[PDB]
């Protein structure tokens, strides 16, 4: 694991997905960011693994 | 012992200023004065009696217990003097059954419901050895009354969160009602009497009438039955990788 | 929901009294100090994305150790739950400036927070450093009015006091 | 309980929305004529001793079998417990006119009230007439159209305040119906 | 003592709370009404000997039977004690305008008075006929200001509802 | 309440029998394996704070509508009450594993629990899911097959204690269903 | 499917006749109207994951009671089946703009729906509030054209009137 | 439990005069600085958790034998109780500053406080110091001369109200002596 305290201050960057209570989680549980409902996206089912090799 | 309802959704409990006034040697208490006094007496009259709506010619017989209360500022002695009155036995002892009288002593003087048949039968063991004054002074001089109310505050219905039985919270909610609710509406007839002696529980709509404002009063009821079947043996299985294990 | 109206009639009900001539004066204070706490509230409503974007990375510029394995913001779901929990708090600061008292904060945001954040190892000092960043980010003639900054920076350090 | 400002907050928290710029002209126009809410709650509670007396005394004059033996305000303990029983109905309406919302009327006064009035033999069809007499008397104090006690107010209208309090007396008038 | 300040500091003490923003908004309403309920209070301090001498000699205009033997004021000695018990109320109406609440009325001049006026055979309905004579003789646009009238008339009407 | 020795003598009291050597060979093996019963309950109370917070937040993970507006784990007020409740359930099943009889879990904790939850609005399908996570956490500490936190035991099988405590966790789901 | 072709073929099959001159005149209406209703069916098929998820939480923004115990939005599976069942309905509206009639909505979404949403206790006014939100979200020059929005909304309130 | 308006009337019932024109100017010089009093009491309650924790920890620094074994702030149970006590003292002085009258502090807090500390062994020579730390820290936050946290105010004179809240800390240090 990276320690993240041994770096200089200002070099660890973080960024949230949206600064909103209502896009991170709606009134229903259909949240794209919080919880186990991050697999329910219409894309991101297949991938690009014909980039590498037949290894 | 967190209790998400208590000082959040209800009010704060009323009472005297402090308990350090008894150790003060030039006074007996922070002296409240007769606007700060009688509005505390309004809260003892609304709690020991239910909402009994006592008249002007019924409060005149309680003239002596207030005149001692505004000098000796103990709240517990005022509650003890009001439970030995004629106005407490003509409402809760005279035309009621024995477990109706006992279940209102837990409401008026403890703010909870009785947890057991063994706890309830020991209050009838004190009726045989001293009558109704042996029941009342044993509640007042108990350890449970000392470490919740003391001499300082009125005995209020306290949402604790960490009840010693879960059924104790249920019988507290049946006993208190809404604020437009007194305790003469049944003709005698203890409400908790069947559930104490059998060991079952209460009805969900009767408890959720007495819950505060803002606590989902009634939802969660499936449209099938409201209690549990003690004879049912369900199969609850856990998924492991291979199959499903019924650790029963 | 402690406000000016929901305390003067929760004392009028505790003695069994009518609306007194005392309590008709306390709603005359709701007429006067409304226009500094409504104009501080409406400024927060059209600027909310900007003020919680800057408040949230004040936690992470300060505390780089939170991305370590086992700490609070160790993955992107937890970073998204950090910026949610400071979007909730300043929504309640917007709510307290409408009701006029500290009612919506201490029964939706503060009650339970000692017990929730201890069990989940969320540090209180990182919650404070986000809210104390935007308390002195407030500029007195530039952002809002003079007395409107007093109302907005009364509920902020209420929340810094009650968390610490 | 919720007042008229905290009603708008618990509607927007269901949306998880900030109280923006569109709801605030329902709350800047609450406090604009908000003198008149204080200038008319004072018109009820100044006359509230006479108002509960003329309410139940007109309840006798249209159902004269209440004071017959068998009726529920026959004896002298029962007649004192319905002068005072309509004091509490008049008290929680005057809280709700001060608050702008019927939350303190419904939680602290209307919950379980009919549930006990069938348990005590209170005739609910004649207690509706007890409420609706003082409903008519309260909305003419606010309108200042009474015969006696012409309380000097300022010139304008309180037509919406007379109908908000008439909705509060219809909430108790439909709860025990 | 019932005032507008003692309500919000006993409601803060009962929950163990510091004085927050809703409490300080209620003191701001006491600054607004102080320009009317003090000018009516100072008007009653110099005009009392022409208005407590208007009430009781018109108390006996409606109630003529109180000069009869066997009733209350059968001699001249008790009428001079009848003008003491209406100078004791206008001196307490003057105090509650100064302090804002109903404190000097309810805990001095009201508490206990149901039982003294029951046992000593004094009619309460001549006090109601005499306090209300100072209500309808009061007009606004010569005697005092507009909001000094409606604060004085709302404090004469408080103990009319307490004695009835 | 009863324990595993008191459960046998109330069975013999229905027959007025004596607890003799036929009935005593179940109780002579309860004391023979009695070191492993103590060895298993400090495998649970040493990890009990980690077990509750993983089970409650693992229930939030499979159901994110519990923390949206209108979920019943929404604010700090409701989430701390859910964390308190799962610690109470884990406390009473550690009493029941120690005694060897599920009496004290069934009358103090579970009796009347279904009626509290349908009056307070608590969802019972997700509440069963938080108990069913910490059932699987409890059988992994007893058999020493957890991925972190290998504790130091002695060698043998504790496979009848792991399924005895799995039946105590199954009574919680059967009582709130 | 109920369509323009299958109506005029079935009408001329029950009569036992060849396609007449009035049966070819109806398919010409299918040509001049196909430009508008295939624009709506292509606009919907490209942006359907954002239209479904915007309407799925418009159910729970109106009815927050569905997260209560025993309701239909308790756990994660029940909201996965709820966002599925809304996406099923938006697929059938895409199928109805392609075919040209209410064929796929009738046979696959509406027939048998009253007996399923009552047996499984799904509140049918919440399978409506998501459909009614999409009908008023549509801006008539922004997302599609004028006549493409007439066709899009007319299949959207056919479903509303069939659930009501 | 009085305030500053309820002090001039309990000095005037003894003479039984109307409060007339001569003594009403002393309360008109209360509502002149009424917004000055409201601006002053907001600055204490915004800094109150820092004012206590700097005071009690400086008492440990000025008196390092307090955390020795046998000391009064030795263990965690005792150290939490002294921080609990300084919260109540700073709360009751701020009640007195808002009312403008010491009769909220002297009754509800100072009755029996001298006899309770000698019954518990709580030493008064350190609590005269730790009250007097936050006495001098309260006049910094009123007159804006604090080192950190320059709060935003209006330009005027507040040195009468800073001395008036110094006198409430003299009423504490007299009574616990
Ligand atoms: C505290 C961290 C303990 C500890 C506890 C264990 N947890 C075990 C299993 C487990 N945990 C979760 C919740 C986790 N999964 C998620 O998807 C999410 C977020 C949404 C979380 C927080 C689940 C679902 C499970 C499995 C339960 C089941 O199968 O139904 C566990 C079991 C053993 C194992 O993981 O192999 C233990 C012991 N683990 C530790 O070592 C520290 C002491
Ligand atoms: C199954 C849960 C474990 C495992 C368990 C075994 N533990 C065995 C013996 C054992 N455990 C303790 C400590 C326990 N006894 C106490 O009295 C107290 C507290 C007061 C505790 C925590 C002791 C003392 C012993 C006895 C051996 C010794 O004295 O060192 C054990 C041996 C069988 C038996 O003698 O009962 C087993 C199999 N070992 C495992 O592999 C799984 C993971
Ligand atoms: C969200 C808007 C709702 C809510 C909805 C639920 N609907 C559920 C199940 C369901 N929906 C349908 C109709 C759907 N299936 C189809 O094949 C087609 C057309 C091609 C449509 C429109 C059916 C037949 C079913 C039952 C079968 C199933 O399980 O999918 C549902 C599941 C019910 C359950 O879990 O028992 C939910 C929860 N839930 C809400 O809270 C609001 C009301
Ligand atoms: C809260 C953290 C405020 C704050 C208040 C102030 N305290 C001030 C001075 C002060 N602090 C102590 C305790 C300190 N001195 C020590 O020697 C030790 C450790 C052993 C500690 C913790 C003392 C004794 C004093 C001086 C009191 C006196 O002698 O008059 C102070 C400066 C003086 C003043 O302006 O009041 C302030 C502002 N300090 C802060 O920065 C935040 C805002
Ligand atoms: C009238 C003849 C006197 C007078 C009377 C006052 N007594 C006051 C209080 C008081 N009186 C008693 C004695 C009485 N009350 C009882 O309960 C019992 C025993 C059952 C007896 C004999 C007590 C105990 C008290 C104190 C209780 C209380 O605080 O009310 C009193 C009130 C004083 C005050 O306002 O603090 C009065 C005025 N005083 C007189 O000047 C005349 C001569
Ligand atoms: C960001 C400044 C923090 C940080 C925060 C995290 N918070 C986590 C969860 C969380 N936050 C709250 C409070 C919030 N929820 C509400 O409903 C309201 C008011 C309406 C507020 C203020 C709660 C109750 C929870 C727990 C439940 C949940 O998951 O939503 C969180 C996830 C917890 C976990 O890791 O298991 C994180 C990471 N993270 C940071 O690094 C700083 C300290
Ligand atoms: C968390 C896993 C649940 C959940 C829990 C909530 N429980 C709430 C209140 C509550 N819970 C209990 C039962 C608990 N207390 C006991 O004393 C015993 C047995 C000894 C048990 C099992 C009681 C009695 C109460 C009410 C008392 C009180 O808290 O004052 C609760 C609060 C509801 C509200 O704020 O309205 C919650 C949220 N809810 C969930 O969603 C998960 C599944
Ligand atoms: C017309 C009434 C207004 C207007 C409204 C806005 N709509 C906004 C976003 C938006 N609208 C829709 C629905 C519509 N687009 C579609 O693709 C379909 C069906 C296939 C429909 C019914 C969606 C899905 C979205 C989100 C995606 C996006 O456009 O960013 C919008 C932006 C704010 C918002 O997120 O809602 C506005 C202001 N816009 C106008 O200019 C006229 C005045
Ligand atoms: C702190 C700066 C002191 C100090 C304080 C201790 N006080 C302890 C107990 C205690 N303190 C009070 C008074 C407090 N309660 C109130 O209600 C009010 C005002 C209205 C005040 C000031 C009481 C009544 C008690 C007894 C209750 C209890 O013990 O919790 C205490 C603990 C004593 C013990 O553990 O036996 C401490 C350490 N001690 C110090 O060194 C500084 C000077
Ligand atoms: C002494 C501590 C300061 C200083 C104080 C002054 N403050 C003045 C005015 C002022 N303060 C407030 C806010 C206050 N009123 C409220 O109703 C509430 C909360 C409910 C608070 C916190 C207001 C509204 C005002 C009035 C001015 C305005 O409306 O903008 C002030 C001016 C005189 C006065 O009205 O009191 C002074 C001198 N200024 C100083 O020099 C020191 C540092
Ligand atoms: C059977 C016997 C009998 C009575 C006792 C009276 C009772 C009575 N009074 C009023 C009617 C009224 N009551 C009042 C109230 C008051 N009027 C004042 O002069 C005071 C200031 C104040 C308290 C006494 C007013 C102002 C009206 C007139 C209607 C109105 O203006 O609202 C009404 C009409 C209510 C209605 O229409 O529903 C009735 C039934 N009438 C009867 O038939
Ligand atoms: C917060 C709201 C609130 C209320 C409204 C009351 C509701 C209420 N009223 C009564 C009690 C009563 N209520 C009535 C009222 C009436 N009977 C009539 O014939 C008229 C139609 C009507 C108006 C005069 C009477 C006569 C009694 C007394 C019955 C009795 O003495 O048994 C009681 C029983 C009290 C007791 O004696 O123990 C209660 C709870 N209490 C509350 O706390
Ligand atoms: C502490 C107690 C307290 C009160 C009693 C009120 C007193 C009060 N009422 C009004 C003011 C008013 N009051 C009325 C009301 C009426 N005029 C009528 O002819 C109708 C009969 C009646 C409707 C109910 C109107 C119309 C105004 C002026 C417009 C407004 O600002 O609301 C005003 C503003 C001054 C003015 O506009 O002249 C004040 C201070 N406010 C308080 O703070
Ligand atoms: C603080 C308490 C207080 C009052 C209740 C009134 C009462 C009052 N009225 C009058 C005396 C008078 N008051 C009036 C005034 C009026 N006559 C009317 O019918 C009109 C409605 C009204 C005009 C506003 C008149 C015309 C007289 C002289 C006639 C008389 O003796 O009443 C006097 C004699 C001295 C004086 O004029 O002030 C007093 C004390 N004045 C007070 O200072």
Q: Domains in chain D, please, with CATH?
A: 1-177 (1.10.490.20)
Q: Which of residues 105-164 of B touch F (CB under 8 A)?
A: 161-162, 164
Beta strands in H24-139 (DSSP E): none
Radius of gyration of chain E (CA): 18
CA distance B9 to B160: 13
Residue with the two structure tokens 């499936």: B222
Cβ contact E133:E55 at 8 Å:
yes
DSSP-assigned states of every residue in chain G: ---SHHHHHHHHHHTT----HHHHHHHHHHHHTHHHHHHHHHHHHHSHHHHHHHHHHHHHHH-GGGGSTTSSSSSHHHHHHHHHHHHHHHHHHHHHHHHSSSHHHIIIIITTHHHHHHHTT--TTHHHHHHHHHHHH--TTTTS-HHHHHHHHHTHHHHHHHH-
Tokens, residue F58: 């693992």
Nearest to G135 by CA among G111, G112, G154, G120: G154
Tell whether D41 is within 8 A of chain C (Cβ): yes
Residue of chain B minimizing CA distance to H118: B23
Ligand number nearest to the C-alpha of C62: 6
Cα dihedral across residues E97, E99, E100, E101: positive or negative: negative
Dihedral (CA of H101, H104, H107, H113) sign? negative
Tell me the two tokens of residue B44.
Answer: 């003892």
Q: What are the angstrom distances between the C-alpha of C115 and each of F57, F80, F121? A: 14, 6, 22
Resolution of this structure in Å: 3.3
Please say whether the beta carbons of B120 and B99 come within 8 A: yes
- Closest CA in chain G for residue A27: G60
Residues with CB under 6 A from ligand 3: G 59, 66, 72-73, 78, 81-82, 85-86, 88-89, 108-109, 116, 120, 122-123, 126-127, 130
Q: After which residues is chain B broken (C to N over 2.5 A)?
A: none
Domain extents for chain C? 1-164
- Record: contact F123-G76, CB cut-off 8 A: no
Q: What is the dihedral of CA D143, D149, D150, D152, to 10 degrees?
A: -100
Angle in degrees, CA H49, C127, H133, rounded to 5: 15
The ligand 10 atom at the shortest distance from the C-alpha of residue C147 is 30
Q: Which of residues 16-75 of F touch A (CB under 8 A)?
A: 60-71
Mutate to test the interface with E, among H9, H107, H138 (most CBs of E within 10 A): H9
Q: Quickly count: other Cβ atoms within 10 Å of residue E104's Cβ.
A: 26
Contact yes or no for F166/B247 (Cβ under 8 A): yes
The rounded distance, in Å, linking the Cα atoms of B60 and B75 is 20
DSSP class of residue B14 equals P
Own/partner pairs for C9-15, CB < 8 Å, 24+ apart?
Answer: C9/D1, C9/D95, C9/D98, C9/D99, C9/D104, C10/B11, C10/D1, C10/E11, C11/E7, C11/E10, C11/E11, C12/D95, C13/D95, C13/D104, C13/D108, C14/B11, C14/B14, C14/B39, C14/B42, C14/B43, C15/B39, C15/B42
- Written as six digits, the tokens of C160 are 């810094």
C118 Cβ inside 6 Å of ligand 6: no
Does the CB atom of residue D42 touch ligand 13 within 6 A? yes
- For C26, the enclosing helix (H) or strand (E) is helix C23-26
Strands B244-245 and B238-239: antiparallel
Q: How far apart are CA E11 and CA C102, in angstroms?
A: 14
Question: Measured in angstroms, how far is the CA atom of residue E152 from the centroid of ligand 12?
Answer: 35
Considering only CB atoms, C99 lies closest to which of D1, D9, D99, namely D9
Which of F123, F128, F130 has the highest number of chain G CBs within 10 A, making it the mutation to test binding with G? Answer: F123
CA neighbor of H97 nearest in space, from H135, H152, H49 = H135
Residue F139: both structure tokens together: 């059988």
b/e sequence G134-162, b meaning 16+ C-beta within 10 Å: bbeebeeeebbeeebbebbbebbebbeeb
If you search the block for the tokens 């005032």, which residue do you land on? E3
Euclidean distance between CA atoms F119 and G86, whole angstroms:
31
For residue B64, report the distance from its CA to the centre of ligand 5, in Å: 9
Instruction: Give the atom of ligand 13 at the shortest distance from the alpha carbon of D161.
Output: 24
CA end-to-end span of chain F? 24
Give nearest CA residue, ligand 11 atom 14: D137
Query: Exposure pattern of G41-68 as b/e (b: 16+ CB <10 Å)?
Result: bebbeeeeeebbbebbbbbbbbbbbbbb
Name the nearest CA neighbour of F102 among F168, F5, F175, F174.
Answer: F168
E149: nearest Cα among E27, E4, E41, E50? E41
Report which DSSP code applies to E27. Answer: H
Measured CA to CA, the distance from residue B113 to residue B120 in angstroms comes to 10
Q: Do F64 and A29 touch (CB under 8 A)?
A: yes
Residue B71 burial class via C-beta count within 10 angstroms: exposed 0-12, middle 13-18, buried 19 and up? exposed
Q: Which residue has the tokens 């004071």?
A: D67
Q: Whose CA is nearest to atom 11 of ligand 11?
A: D137
Q: Residue D90: name the closest of D59, D133, D121 by CA.
A: D133
* Structural tokens at position H57: 């920890």
Instruction: DSSP letter for E55, please.
Output: H
Do chains E and C touch by CB distance (3+ pairs < 8 Å)? yes
User: Which residues in chain G have Cβ-Cβ distances shorter than 8 Å to F124?
Assistant: 69-70
Three-class secondary structure of residue D57 per DSSP = helix
d(CA F68, nearest CA chain D) in Å: 9
Gap from CA of G137 to ligand 8 centroid (Å): 6
On whether the CB atoms of residues C154 and C41 are closer than 8 A, the answer is no
Residues from chain D that touch G64, judged by Cβ atoms under 8 A, are 14
Whole-number Å distance, alpha carbon D35 to ligand 13 midpoint, is 5
Helix residue ranges, H only, C63-147: 76-99, 103-108, 113-119, 124-131
Task: Give the residue from E10, E11, E29 with the most C CB atoms within 10 Å of its CB, the best one to mutate.
Answer: E29
Establish whether chain G is in contact with chain F, requiring a minimum of 3 CB pairs below 8 angstroms.
yes
Q: Are H84 and H151 in contact (CB under 8 A)?
A: no
Contact E21 C103 (CB under 8 A): no
Q: Give the angle C27-C28-C33 at the CA atoms, nearest 5°.
A: 95
Residue F170, phi then psi, degrees to nearest 5: -80, -20
Measure H85 CA to nearest chain B CA, in Å: 13
Q: Which residues of A touch C123 (CB under 8 A)?
A: none
Rounded Cα–Cα distance for residues B163 and B169 (Å): 7
Q: Are B221 and G70 in contact (CB < 8 Å)?
A: yes
What is residue B218's three-state secondary structure?
A: coil
Please name which ligand lies nearest the alpha carbon of H161: 10
Do the Cβ atoms of H110 and H116 come closer than 8 Å? no
- Taking the CA of H144 as reference, the closest ligand is 10
Calculate the dihedral angle through the C-alpha atoms of D158, D163, D169, D172, rounding to the nearest 10 degrees.
-140
- Residue among F78, F116, F166 whose CB faces B166 most closely: F116
Annotated binding-site ranges of G: 82
Of ligand 5's listed atoms, the one at least distance from the Cα of B71 is 29
Chain C CB contacts of E33 below 8 Å = 25, 28
State the DSSP H helix or E strand holding residue B244, giving kind and residue range, or none if neither: strand B244-245
- Given CB atoms, is E111 within the 8 Å cutoff of chain B? yes
Using CB atoms within 10 A of its CB, is residue G115 exposed (0-12), middle (13-18) or buried (19+)? exposed
Residue C31 near residue C69, CB atoms below 8 Å: no
The pair of structure tokens assigned to H22 is: 């001569």
**Chain E contact for H156, CB < 8 A?**
no
What b/e sequence results for G23-38 when a residue is b if at least 16 CB atoms lie within 10 Å of its CB, and e otherwise? beeeeeeeeeeeebbe
Give the integer Cα–Cα distance in Å for D156 and D143: 10
H-helix or E-strand spanning residue B238: strand B238-239
Find the helix or strand (DSSP H, E) in which B239 lies.
strand B238-239
Closest ligand 10 atom to H36 CA: 36
Q: How many CB atoms lie within 10 A of CB C106?
A: 23
Closest CA to C33 of C118, C152, C142: C152
For residue H120, what are the contacts with CB-CB under 8 A and spacing of at least 6?
none
Question: B31 burial class (0-12, 13-18, 19+ CB within 10 angstroms)?
Answer: middle
The label of the residue with tokens 């697999």 reads A39
Which H or E run includes H116?
helix H113-120
Q: Which residue of chain F is at minimal alpha-carbon distance from D16?
A: F69
Query: Residue D69, SS3?
Result: strand
Residues 6+ apart with CB under 8 A from C124: C117, C163, C164
H/E element holding B6?
A: helix B6-9
DSSP state for residue F163 in the 8-state scheme = T
Contact criterion met (CB < 8 Å) for G80 and A28: no
Name E41's Cβ contacts closer than 8 Å, sequence gap at least 6.
E94, E97, E98, H19, H24
Give the pair of three-digit tokens for residue D58.
Answer: 């007109």
Identify which of B32, B41, B67 to mutate to test ligand 5's pocket (most ligand atoms within 8 A of the CB): B67
Chain E residues whose CB is inside 8 A of the D151 CB are 153
Neighbours of chain B (3+ CB pairs under 8 A): C, D, E, F, G, H
Could you tell me which CATH number the domain at G1-164 has? 1.10.490.20
Ligand 1: residue whose CA is nearest its atom 34: F146
What does the buried/exposed string (b/e) look like for F15-32 if buried means 16 or more CB atoms within 10 Å of the residue's CB? eeeeeeeeeeeebeeeee
Pairwise CA distance, residues B64 & B59, whole Å = 10
In a mutational test of the pocket of ligand 11, which residue from D56, D59, D137, D166 has the highest number of ligand atoms less than 8 Å from its CB? D137
Closest to D146 in 3D by CA, of D154, D134, D155, D156:
D134
Nearest ligand, measured from the Cα of D54: 11
């Amino acid at each position: 694991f990276v320690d993240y305290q041994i770096f200089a201050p200002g070099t660890v960057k973080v960024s949230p997905d949206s600064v909103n209570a209502n896009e991170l989680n709606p009134v229903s549980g259909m949240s794209k960011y919080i919880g186990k409902t991050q697999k329910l996206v219409g894309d991101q089912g297949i991938s690009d693994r014909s980039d590498k090799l037949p290894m | 012992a967190f209790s998400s309802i208590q000082n959040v959704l209800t009010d704060a409990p009323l009472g005297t200023p402090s308990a350090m006034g008894f150790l003060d040697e030039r006074t007996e208490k922070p002296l409240m004065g007769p606007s700060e006094m009688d509005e505390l007496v309004y809260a003892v009259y609304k709690q020991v009696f239910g909402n009994a709506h006592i008249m002007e010619s019924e409060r005149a017989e309680l003239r002596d217990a207030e005149s001692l209360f505004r000098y000796l500022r103990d709240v517990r002695e005022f509650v003890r003097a009001l439970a030995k009155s004629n106005a407490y036995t003509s409402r809760f002892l005279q035309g009621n059954q024995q477990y109706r009288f006992f279940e209102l002593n837990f409401k008026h003087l403890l703010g909870r419901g009785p947890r057991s048949l063994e706890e309830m039968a020991s209050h009838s063991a004190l009726y045989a050895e001293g009558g109704f004054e042996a029941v009342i002074d044993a509640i007042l001089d108990s350890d449970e009354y000392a470490q919740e109310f003391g001499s300082t505050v009125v005995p209020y219905c306290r949402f604790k969160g960490e009840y010693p039985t879960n059924e104790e919270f249920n019988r507290m909610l049946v006993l208190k009602g809404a604020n437009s609710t007194s305790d003469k509406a049944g003709k005698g007839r203890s409400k908790l009497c069947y559930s104490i002696a059998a060991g079952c529980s209460q009805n969900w709509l009767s408890m959720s009438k007495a819950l505060p404002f803002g606590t989902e009063k009634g939802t969660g009821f499936n449209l099938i039955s409201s209690s549990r079947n003690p004879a049912a043996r369900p199969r609850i299985g856990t998924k492991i990788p291979g199959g499903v294990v019924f650790s029963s | 929901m402690k406000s000016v109206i929901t305390t003067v009639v929760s004392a009028a009900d505790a003695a069994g009294r009518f609306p007194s001539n005392s309590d008709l004066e306390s709603i005359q204070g709701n007429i006067q100090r409304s226009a500094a706490r409504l104009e501080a509230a409406e400024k927060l409503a059209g600027n909310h994305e900007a003020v919680v974007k800057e408040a949230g990375d004040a936690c992470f510029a300060k505390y780089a150790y939170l991305k370590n394995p086992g700490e609070a913001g160790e993955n992107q779901e937890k970073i998204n739950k950090c910026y949610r929990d400071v979007d909730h708090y300043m929504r309640l600061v917007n709510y307290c400036l409408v009701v006029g008292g500290t009612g919506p904060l201490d029964e939706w945001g503060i009650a339970g927070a000692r017990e929730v954040y201890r069990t989940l190892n969320l540090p209180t000092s990182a919650y404070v450093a986000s809210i104390a960043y935007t308390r002195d980010r407030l500029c007195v003639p530039r952002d809002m009015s003079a007395q409107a900054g007093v109302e907005f920076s009364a509920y902020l350090d209420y929340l810094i006091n009650a968390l610490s | 309980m919720l007042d008229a400002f905290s009603r708008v907050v618990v509607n927007s928290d269901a949306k998880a929305a900030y109280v923006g710029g569109s709801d605030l002209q329902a709350l800047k126009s609450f406090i604009a004529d908000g003198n008149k809410r204080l200038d008319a709650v004072n018109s009820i509670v100044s006359n509230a001793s006479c108002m509960v007396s003329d309410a139940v005394s007109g309840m006798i004059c249209e159902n004269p079998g209440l004071i017959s033996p068998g009726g529920n305000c026959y004896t002298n303990r029962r007649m004192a417990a319905c002068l005072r029983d309509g004091e509490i109905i008049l008290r929680y309406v005057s809280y709700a006119l001060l608050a702008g919302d019927a939350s303190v009327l419904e939680d602290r006064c209307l919950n379980g009230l009919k549930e006990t009035y069938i348990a005590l033999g209170v005739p609910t069809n004649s207690s509706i007439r007890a409420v609706s007499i003082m409903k008519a008397q309260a909305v003419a104090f606010i309108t200042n159209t009474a015969t006696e006690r012409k309380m000097s107010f300022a010139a304008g209208d309180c037509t919406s305040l007379a109908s908000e309090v008439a909705s509060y007396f219809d909430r108790v008038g439909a709860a025990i119906s």
